[model samples]
Target: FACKTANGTAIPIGGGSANVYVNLAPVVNVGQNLVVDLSTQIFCHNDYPETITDYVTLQRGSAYGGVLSNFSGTVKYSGSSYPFPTTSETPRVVYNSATDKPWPVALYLTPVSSAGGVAIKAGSLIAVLILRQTNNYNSDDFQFVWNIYANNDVVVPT
Candidate 1:
């Protein structure tokens, strides 16, 4: 995906995003790597001064009715500082074939308390692993959305 900066300057694409597309119809075998490049800009209102935490998670569900493969990363947040802080972290996960399921990964950012705001600058990376399944022609589609939360009464304008 691509984005236009506020200064009308086009930012270079690197990694991390809420919407990621993967071509797993081909080499979707066990022990295979499914790399997901993602980046997002999230914010927490300054009216709320709290510790904000952000992390990534993966979920799996089918059109029929089966969900599996749920994984999560470590939570990240800012320290005691005004104006909050724009932090970035990159981490990757390896797919395990032992569990037969389609992985739908997403990022989650939340506030620890009702103070301070968090802004996730655009340009981050969210990577994932490609799992191998027994069914070769089995194709699955999933939806991913970034989850942002405020511990107390705070406004988070998308």
Candidate 2:
């Protein structure tokens, strides 16, 4: 993944989006509904042009709320350019919206792969987070870390 800035910094071969959270609203409370969750698209290319299918997860800790896992509600998806195929296991987002507040609610734009893993494509990566409780906060200063690997077996060959 790379930072393909639209400001002449990167010549995006495809579409998705790229950027990091510049500013995270400091004053966020449970009742004070504001922009708690958000995402930014990342670019993938070349030998590893895009991401496949997979689910996202966070460290097992206070990152969650209600279940003490409430965070910035996040979602995952490759992009609209990637349409759903007939009888295909495109990608899915499963969350517990059963309550006014839910935990582990998000979606990953997992292209073609499997549940345990997905090939992230050369597109948008929704960098999202939600501080549903105390100590959990966003920042203008932040970084991204992902879990990925290489596979000689190409799944999506154009």
Candidate 3:
């Protein structure tokens, strides 16, 4: 599966000696809200199968300019949308007020259900993040990072 931003820009899934990075460069004022829609595409490769996901995670970079305020996950199939995972556990997002290497914030979402998981035959809309800008910076560019997990393993290569 491949991930992307709401505007349909593909997020680089760097591998081997490469690392994932992207600069949103979104325009926003301090205290304003930034809405982010994230999705993934399941390619038609035979090696890829319908699998259960233990969790999907999104972590911000250390110097990210915004705070994760809220998030909700969803699944889409046949041009229709539905609540995600079909499980009892709700999605969770953690903040970095404790200040650790885990970065500014981290969001965890479970995509497994009794039926296995969301039907990922094609593209799937996963979650929408609501981030808030807390302060003004010297530069207008905004930045962040994301890592998704499937079956308790990190999907995006380092």
By TM-score, the best candidate is: 2
lDDT (Cα, tens digit) per residue for candidate 2, span 1-158: 12232122332322232333222333333332222122222222222223222222232111211111222232323232221111122232222222111222223122222211112222223233311111112222122232121112112222
- Candidate 1 regions off by >4 Å? 1-108, 114-118, 126-132, 136-158
Winner by TM-score between candidate 3 and candidate 1:
3
Error of model 1, residue 110, in angstroms: 2.2
**Which 10-residue span in candidate 2 carries the lowest summed lDDT?**
60-69
Candidate 2 wrong stretches, greater than 4 Å: 1-22, 32-41, 46-158
Model 1 weakest 10-residue run by lDDT: 61-70
Per-residue lDDT tens digits of candidate 1, residues 52-151? 2122223321210000121112322221111111123223232222222223332222322221222211222223221111111224222233322211
Model 3 local distance difference test score? 0.24
TM-score per prediction, in order, is 0.19, 0.23, 0.22
Rank by TM-score (best first): 2, 3, 1
lDDT by residue (tens digit), candidate 3, 30-57: 3332222222321111111233111222
Q: What lDDT would each prediction earn against the true structure?
A: 0.23, 0.24, 0.24
